[PDB]
Write a protein that binds this ligand. Structure first.
Ligand SMILES: Fc1ccc(CSc2nnc[nH]2)cc1
Ligand SMILES: [Cl-]
Ligand code: NI
Ligand code: NI
Ligand code: NI
Length: 284
């Protein structure tokens, strides 16, 4: 048997960032300056995003390595935070529209945007950790769902098939392809198992800004005319649900949970469209 429905715990004090680390503009402001930037990056921007992406990948791997029964989500945040700052990177979530931590930790029925807190991870949980680094004036964004101890077959297959859906979408990235093929591949794969792909949350262009206005749908909608072009950088980050798509937000205003409390899994990479195919920027 698995755990029952989560409730919110208490947050640790705000984690400090040394002053020599440049803040993204939106830290300390109610909203962010983003959503109207070019989608294709310059070679110099792409080189800085390789750095940001590899640091984020490091933070995710170190926090992921710690996922185990007994560990709290706040403990995962401390590991991510420290990895980012010791690498000279600002954690993009920290202060983003007031978000109070340095990564999102979303267990079980939490679709996304779980706030690291006193919540204790337990056997059979699935723990998504989503972390973004801001360094060299650019962002790199990545996430993965990690099993804690032995997970029930249905939840283990949900995680594995979500990771496979994500890799299948990434391997469709190639200049000239409609961006829509990503959602077509993800949803067709998910529907084999009777899963539902979340529609209200999407992937996004990313560059000097965290969400540059480019939207990447994870469901099938071929009316979108956008084509993948060399130099474009965006995320693929499908959330796939065992149950229905209906959701609710906690009183904290951030934590997004499935209304029927059935579990959900997500993976995410920041990608570059190259002249021949794709490069994953959030790689170790
Ligand atoms: F409003 C928020 C709060 C936290 C995040 C970081 S999780 C995430 N990574 N790609 C999309 N979302 C993003 C937006
Ligand atoms: Cl989002
Ligand atoms: Ni998000
Ligand atoms: Ni993310
Ligand atoms: Ni993202």
């Amino acid at each position: 048997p698995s755990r029952t429905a989560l409730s919110p715990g208490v947050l640790s004090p705000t984690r400090p960032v040394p002053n020599w680390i440049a803040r993204p503009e939106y830290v300390g402001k109610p909203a962010a300056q983003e959503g109207s930037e070019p989608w294709v990056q310059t070679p110099e921007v792409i080189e800085k995003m390789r750095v940001a992406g590899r640091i984020a990948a490091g933070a995710l791997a170190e926090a992921g390595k710690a996922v185990a029964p007994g560990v709290t989500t706040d403990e995962l945040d401390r590991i991510a935070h420290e990895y980012l700052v010791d690498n000279g990177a600002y954690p993009s979530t920290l202060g983003y529209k007031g978000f109070p931590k340095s990564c999102c930790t979303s267990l079980n029925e939490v679709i996304c945007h779980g706030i690291p807190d006193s919540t204790v991870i337990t056997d059979g949980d699935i723990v998504n950790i989503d972390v973004t680094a801001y360094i060299g004036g650019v962002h790199g964004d990545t996430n993965a769902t990690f099993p804690a101890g032995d997970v029930a077959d249905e939840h283990r297959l949900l995680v594995d098939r979500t990771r496979e859906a994500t890799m299948r979408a990434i391997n469709t990235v190639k200049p000239g392809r409609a961006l829509s093929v990503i959602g077509r591949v993800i949803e067709s794969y998910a529907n084999r198992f009777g899963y539902n792909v979340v529609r209200d949350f999407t992937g996004h262009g990313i560059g000097t800004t965290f969400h540059n206005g480019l939207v990447v749908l994870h469901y099938d909608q071929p009316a979108v005319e956008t084509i993948m072009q060399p130099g474009m950088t965006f995320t693929i980050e499908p959330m796939i649900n065992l149950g229905a798509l209906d959701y609710e937000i906690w009183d904290d205003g951030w934590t997004v949970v499935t209304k029927d409390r059935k579990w959900t899994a997500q993976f995410e990479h920041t990608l570059l469209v190259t002249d021949t195919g794709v490069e994953i920027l959030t790689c170790l």
